[PDB]
């Protein structure tokens, strides 16, 4: 029994030694030469209001115009960004919604929360009313993130240390990913859609192969829980935001910490992170009522989107990178550009 | 300016906004309560008597006041990641059994720690607590079997039901680190017929009166 623990410690030491050997050059040492990005001034082009409670998540449609936002009032609102109209207002059965997703094709929109159930809502329906398509029961902990892998199957992360891949037509989880030591709070599919990553309150991130069914790599370095994840657009790196007030860029191939973004004044955690289209800007929302735009290559704090009355809870950059929408607990989504 | 059907879209948005406002008002009229306490503390029995795979929601209607009681005991996951969802709840019902000396690994001390954690939570600085002390009928003799000194060496002065219960009440009420911002309303259920619902209504209406009183500057 104890011999197995010794073997695990030896394997951890071997991994640590290999990663340290691979660290032949810090990212800052090589990215210092490039010209820094100047202060990024962004104005709230639109203010999407109508929610009566905290915004807990939002997602951009693949067309870069429609965006769905979820809040504790028990409503999913599908805003048209270019005009701020309510295309749809889906009333939820359980108002404790902690995440939402917009299907890549735009037909379906999913959301989940403390009910432990991921509900799929069909938008392009003949009857004209958004009716729930399915309820993917099977989890034992609150749902913290949903992302449509396809119109047929999706992937869900829960607070019971498990992640899952569900088939929507069958309504049962085709794959179950296990290995986390604590609650899983965030999830983000890869650009190629074959791999994804999940960050957990065990202060670690996991890279999962969807089809294989088992993790490939584990990334450590955070001091506290991870609340947000996003894939670098190239698909070969991802940035994690945690409660220890530090964002961190990890590289899959190098399999180690690449950079850390933090500031002494910044003492609270990160609720959501997202990249820019070129990957040169990393926008992270903080508990301190405002979001910060970081030069992802030089780590310099490039800008501040301080416009929210309460905690910023979610944010997302369109597919074309035209605008970044941020939603906070003061119930207003604002689109900066 | 707007096209023939852009105006139609704007009209649809305005109608959706009207529906959203109506639903928001209806939801604001409702009272919300968060239910906490150990499963063996009679919480299930309390909700059953008062009601006349994750979060559970119960709906009551007493004296024209709609109560939404969120029983979240089934969420056997990490707290501090979903507790802030209930930041705006108007009260925290907190059940505890007066006979919690049984499961010695003591459970009275564990309930005390839980109450200390919940009362002083930064999310519940304003949210008041409605403390329920259950198992009075059998506690009245369990106290006779063994004195409170087995749990609190200080214990009740005279080992008696009344004095011991008052001591337990005081012990749990002094855990409130913010006397000004909260009022811990305590009740001894004793498996009463319907006094639980009436007491919840009284505590809730008092909390509402004081919330309005604070909003309009009188308090």
């Amino acid at each position, epitope marked *: 029994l104890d011999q197995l623990r010794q073997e695990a410690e030896q394997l951890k030491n071997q991994i640590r030694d290999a990663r340290k050997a691979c660290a032949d050059a810090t990212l800052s040492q090589i990215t210092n030469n490039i010209d820094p990005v100047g202060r990024i001034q962004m104005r709230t082009r639109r203010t999407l209001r109508g929610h009566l409670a905290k915004i807990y998540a939002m997602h951009w449609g693949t067309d870069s115009r*429609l965006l769905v936002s979820a809040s504790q009032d028990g409503k999913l609102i599908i805003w048209d960004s270019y005009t701020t109209n309510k*295309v749809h207002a889906i009333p939820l059965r359980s108002s404790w919604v902690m995440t939402c997703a917009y299907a890549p094709s735009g037909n379906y929109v999913a959301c989940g929360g403390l009910d432990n159930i991921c509900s799929i809502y069909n938008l392009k329906t*003949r009857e*004209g009313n958004v009716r729930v398509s399915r309820e993917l029961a099977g989890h034992t902990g609150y749902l913290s993130c949903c992302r449509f892998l396809d119109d047929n199957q999706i992937v869900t992360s829960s607070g019971d240390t498990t992640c899952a891949l569900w088939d929507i037509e069958t309504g049962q989880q085709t794959t179950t990913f296990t290995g986390h030591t604590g609650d899983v709070m965030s999830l983000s599919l890869a650009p190629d859609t074959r791999l994804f990553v999940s960050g957990a309150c065990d202060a670690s991130a996991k890279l999962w192969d969807v089809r294989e069914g088992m993790c490939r790599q584990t990334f450590t370095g955070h001091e506290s829980d991870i609340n947000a994840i996003c894939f670098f657009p190239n698909g070969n790196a991802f940035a994690t935001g945690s409660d220890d007030a530090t964002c961190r860029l990890f590289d899959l191939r190098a399999d180690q910490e690449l950079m850390t973004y933090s500031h002494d004044n910044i003492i609270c955690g990160i609720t959501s992170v997202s990249f820019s289209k070129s990957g040169r800007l990393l926008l992270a929302g903080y508990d301190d009522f405002n979001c910060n735009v970081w030069d992802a290559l030089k780590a310099d704090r490039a800008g501040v989107l301080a416009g929210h009355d309460n905690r910023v809870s979610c944010l997302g950059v369109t597919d074309d990178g035209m605008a970044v929408a941020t939603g906070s607990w003061d119930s207003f989504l604002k689109i900066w550009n | 300016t707007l096209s023939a*059907e*852009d*105006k*139609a*879209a704007v*009209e649809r948005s305005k109608m959706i906004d009207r529906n959203l406002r109506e639903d928001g008002e209806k939801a604001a009229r409702e009272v919300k309560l968060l239910l906490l306490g150990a499963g063996e503390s009679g919480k299930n029995t309390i909700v059953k008597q008062m009601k006349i795979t994750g979060i559970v929601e119960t709906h009551f209607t007493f004296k024209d006041l709609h109560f939404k009681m969120f029983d979240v005991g089934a969420q056997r996951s990490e707290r501090k990641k979903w507790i802030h969802c209930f930041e705006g709840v108007t009260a925290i019902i907190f059940c505890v059994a007066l006979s919690d000396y049984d499961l010695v690994l003591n459970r009275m001390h564990a309930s005390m720690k839980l109450f200390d954690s919940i009362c002083n939570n930064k999310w519940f600085t304003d949210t008041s607590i409605i403390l329920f002390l259950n198992k009075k009928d059998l506690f009245e003799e369990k106290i006779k079997k063994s004195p409170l000194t087995i749990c609190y060496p200080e214990y009740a002065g005279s080992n008696t039901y009344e004095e011991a219960a008052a001591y337990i009440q005081c012990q749990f009420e002094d855990l409130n680190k913010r006397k000004d911002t909260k009022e811990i309303y305590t009740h001894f259920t004793c498996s009463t017929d319907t006094k639980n619902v009436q007491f919840v209504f009284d505590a809730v209406t008092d909390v509402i009166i004081k919330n309005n009183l604070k909003d309009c500057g009188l308090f």
Partner: single-chain antibody
Amino acid sequence: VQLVESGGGLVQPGGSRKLSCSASGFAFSSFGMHWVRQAPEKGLEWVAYISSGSGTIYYADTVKGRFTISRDDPKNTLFLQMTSLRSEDTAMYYCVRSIYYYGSSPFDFWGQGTTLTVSSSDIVMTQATSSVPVTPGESVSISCRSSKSLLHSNGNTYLYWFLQRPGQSPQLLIYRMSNLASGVPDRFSGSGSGTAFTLTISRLEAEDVGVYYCMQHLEYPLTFGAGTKLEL
């Protein structure tokens, strides 16, 4: 999804009649509705429009102040009250559906039609040919022209193409002049620019023969084309 309708029949000139349109199988309360007429042997002609919630109403100038459009959501019904009817009002009336939100498909579903026999600034739109001979398996194009460009500033060319097969109510084929209505065989394609639009059919086969109608929804009234017939 279904829209039955009744109330038509023989009415002497100067009388009145209330056409009723009973809707079932869809969310009526959220759908704006139209009444569209078609003469006994001529093309379509828009009659009236009522938005969801009855907050907006429009009438064709030839019935303004004579026809009143109403809607009762609780019973899911639509009403057209006509008074002082004339010989020009004899036609088949169709209860037409329409939902307006970004990316919607207005005029998707049409009623079965109710006939009405009476005892004895607008954007002009035209179609090149009234009747075209076609051969199955061939590719055929239909051309249409508008008086003024239909390309609004936002970029939506508000042109619509409808198909009316013999003895059947017209069904939407194309909306916005490029988007393809759901359920069509996918052979049809819409293209063109302001004042000149076209509908192309590749690999023509059965069920295509019929009258094609063009329409615009840039400004009211919604002027229809004269109709182009494809016959064997």
